Amino acid sequence: SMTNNKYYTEENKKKVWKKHMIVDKFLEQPGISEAYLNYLQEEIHNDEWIGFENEFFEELTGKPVINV
Amino acid sequence: SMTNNKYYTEENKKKVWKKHMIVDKFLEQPGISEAYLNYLQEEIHNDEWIGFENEFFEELTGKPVINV
Ligand SMILES: [Ca+2]
């Protein structure tokens, strides 16, 4: 969670990996998953997300979070 | 699956990085942020989260997701 390639350190990569594992469980909780869907349905049209087309597509259509 | 270092590839690191930015804005929405901190309060005790205590602490006390 930062747009700076300078902060894109493998230590921060691991930090972010683990925090995403934590929040992923929260997103699957009933109610929350629907409000998250509503958020994405709104956010996918927000042109501030330059270059995130593919990640918005994967989250909205329920594609896996990572590539196995 | 995110626990297996076999998939800790660089493509997956970047994918997680960008998806975590998307999810971070949702967690700042009013209502959701409270529900998330409640979730964290409950879940910190579960043994699934052994060795995630630093991340739970950072998320619980409003630390930046990455160091910076
Ligand atoms: Ca809806």
Numbering used by the authors:
A (entry chain A), B (entry chain C): 0 to 67
Study text:
Here we determined that the arbitrium system in Bacillus subtilis phage phi3T modulates the bacterial toxin–antitoxin system MazE–MazF to regulate the phage life cycle. AimX also inhibits the function of phi3T_93, a protein that promotes lysogeny by binding to MazE and releasing MazF. In all structures, phi3T_93 shows an identical all-helices fold composed of a longer N-terminal helix (α1), followed by two shorter helices (α2 and α3) connected by a long unstructured loop forming a V-like shape. The α1 helices of two phi3T_93 monomers interact, resulting in a W-shaped tight and globular dimer that displays two shallow grooves, one across each side of the dimer molecule.
Our in silico complexes indicate that the AimX M14 residue plays an essential role in phi3T_93 and MazF recognition and substituting for a charged residue in that position should prevent AimX function. Next, we produced phi3T_93L23D by replacing a hydrophobic residue that interacts with the AimX M14 for a negatively charged one. The new charged residue had no impact on the protein integrity and quaternary organization as confirmed by solving its crystal structure and SEC analyses. BLI analysis showed no binding of phi3T_93L23D to AimX and a strong reduction (two orders of magnitude) in its affinity for MazE. Overexpression in the recipient cell of phi3T_93, but not of the phi3T_93L23D, restored the ability of the evolved phage to produce lysogens. This confirmed that phi3T_93–AimX interactions are important for the lysis–lysogeny decision. In addition, strains expressing phi3T_93, unlike those expressing phi3T_93L23D, blocked the lytic cycle and promoted lysogeny of the wt phi3T (measured by plaque and colony counts 3 h after infection). These results validate both the structural complexes and the common mechanism of recognition observed for AimX–phi3T_93 and MazE–MazF, which are driven mainly by the insertion of a hydrophobic helix into the grooves of the dimers of phi3T_93 and MazF.
